[PDB]
Nucleic acid binder design. Structure first.
Lengths: 102, 154, 37
RNA sequence: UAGCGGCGAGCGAACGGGGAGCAGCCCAGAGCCUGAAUCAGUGUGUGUGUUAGUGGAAGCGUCUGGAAAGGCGCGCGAUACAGGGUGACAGCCCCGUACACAAAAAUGCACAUGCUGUGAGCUCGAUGAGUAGGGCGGGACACGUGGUAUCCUGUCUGAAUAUGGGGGGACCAUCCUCCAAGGCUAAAUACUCCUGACUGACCGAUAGUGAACCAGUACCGUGAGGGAAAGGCGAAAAGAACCCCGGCGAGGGGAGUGAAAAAGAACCUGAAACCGUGUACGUACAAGCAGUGGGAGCACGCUUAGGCGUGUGACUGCGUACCUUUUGUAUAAUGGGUCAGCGACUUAUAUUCUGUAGCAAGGUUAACCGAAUAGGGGAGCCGAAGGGAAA
RNA sequence: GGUUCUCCCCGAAAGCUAUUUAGGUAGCGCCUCGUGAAUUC
């Protein structure tokens, strides 16, 4: 019963990048999600003599709180809450404000 | 004396002694302190208060509220359905924000409606304490509630 | 080891009823070392 | 409390009443009649609960700021604002609450049916023998075998059923009940080492518990007993690529990242005391636990002449330092190295005395019960016949 | 040894008395807070 899932179109509600849309890549058990292209962090990658020698500065994605993003409605062009309803015995997600199935 | 109404303007008869006595500052304070001490759990600070002293304090507080027109007597105060909006609307039109709905009999619809609101509190005549009466900005009674208050005060 | 566990060991107290009360306090206060060996 | 004790301090009962959150059974039973009434144990099915879960309405935006839970204007919600976490103080961006549903296993409280079940009503009888008392030999009941009651009675012996015994707040007497070996009796009340929910005029790392994390620890002792210090990680680890110096280190300086870098693995804020640098003033002829005041000279900002104030301040005058302990503490008589944190409650339970406040010749109830502080309840403690030594 | 911070007004004694039984029982003029209070001293 998680509102945010593996493949979801979400929009940032708060933070330095509020309002930019994106797709969630994965969700952490600590109530955090990773969405590509918004929370860029410049990590100084220490060089290693192993098979991989990227070194330099890497542009990674930093996880953000689940509550900081909402599913994009994609029809009203604004963030909307999502709830659960039982249909033919299968639990599904649905928007609000003219709620329609995903 | 005579308690003026605002909707029906119907005369009410109440004993002068129990609603027109002077304001005993010292007695009221001691009862309030005693009530606050009884609220603790000391995890006992409870203090004995004489029945006459407790009753005398309530009469003084009731008299003071009437003088400062913080007490309003109305007819039955009920809500057709258990919805907070109905109670909120019925108070906004009356221009009441911090009120104590003291009713003659506990009604589930009214009780549920006021349970969410924090500035609005609903109680029965039996369930009244000096601290709540003073704390709440306004108190609205019912005719039946006043009548039962008269007799048990005596 | 030789003359240490035969008189100050675990079985040296369970052989009588008086030594049973000695090992009873080790159960309530379970240290890292129960008995010497 | 009525009693008991060199009537020294202490220890220490009952009936009635105010409060019912008690429910009073079976056997000595022959005979006419049994799978009865009242119930328990062991299975299945239905209905109602407990122990794991799911669905569950309700805030869109703008200014300032890197980032908004707060501010201004317009609304929804409210049986639901109990609490905490979600970049700053969040009903409505998440996790928890009304309302509406499910039973493959197990358990508990009323009810269909079945097998084994110590077993009723009516009539005809009964109401408990190695005992009490007495004799010989011991101990424990405060009492040494006393003026001595009551409780227990090995071995050797031995009665009765209103012709014998106890009780009615205990001389003798009367009437009723009772008069020796049977078998049972729930819950509340006691107690808090473990779980879930809920609560607070208790506390926040020298507090609280030995112990908030790898505390029943490191370490010590033959064993046992006893017994320390230590998180203030950041919102997110963005926890230094490259270059220079050096010892292919430690440590430090740049750049980059971030709102902030004297917060850089001693890591939010960083005091007093101890130990340094730079500037200004005084001291190398000064008076021995000398500080304030008066006075001269000099320095960084008085200031459209104004020795106005502070720190420093040669020299002068006044004064036998301070605390504890004492018939005195200026003493060859004695005590503390300083700073920070911590530290030796006047409570609970009787009586007595004082102050404050409500009906005015009903001033007061405790426990329990209660829509859990009000209402209801007076069996006690403290008072209401003074004057009169007392009556 | 120790009755702990601050603060305003006021504030009992030396070698003594009765005199036993000793590191103590009755008891100290003058002085304090409250009350009573007559030109009493």
């Amino acid at each position: 019963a998680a509102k945010i899932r593996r493949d979801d179109e979400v929009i940032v509600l708060t933070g330095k990048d509020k309002g930019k849309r994106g797709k969630v890549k994965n969700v952490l058990s600590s109530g955090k999600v990773i969405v590509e292209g918004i929370n860029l962090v410049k990590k100084h990658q220490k060089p290693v003599p192993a098979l991989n020698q990227p070194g330099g500065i890497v542009e990674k994605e930093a996880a953000i709180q689940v509550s900081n993003v909402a599913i994009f409605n994609a029809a009203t062009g604004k963030a909307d809450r999502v709830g659960f309803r039982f249909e033919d015995g299968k639990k599904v997600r649905f928007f609000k404000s003219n709620s329609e199935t995903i | 004396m005579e308690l003026v109404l605002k909707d029906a303007q119907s005369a009410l008869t109440v004993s002068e002694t129990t609603f027109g006595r002077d304001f005993n500052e010292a007695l009221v304070h001691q009862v309030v302190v005693a009530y606050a001490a009884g609220a603790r759990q000391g995890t006992d600070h409870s203090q004995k208060v004489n029945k006459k002293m407790y009753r005398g304090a309530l009469k003084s507080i009731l008299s003071e509220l009437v003088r400062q027109d913080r007490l309003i007597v109305v007819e039955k105060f009920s809500v057709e359905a258990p919805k907070t909006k109905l109670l909120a609307q019925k108070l906004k039109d009356m221009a009441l924000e911090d009120v104590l709905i003291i009713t003659g009999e506990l009604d589930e619809n009214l009780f549920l409606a006021a349970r969410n609101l924090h500035k609005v509190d609903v109680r029965d005549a039996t369930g009244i304490d000096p601290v709540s009466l003073i704390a709440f900005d306004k108190v609205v009674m019912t005719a039946d509630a006043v009548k039962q208050v008269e007799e048990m005060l005596a | 080891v030789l003359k240490r566990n035969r008189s100050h060991g675990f079985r040296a107290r369970m052989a009588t009823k008086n030594g049973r009360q000695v090992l009873a306090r080790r159960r309530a206060k379970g240290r890292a070392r129960l008995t010497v060996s």
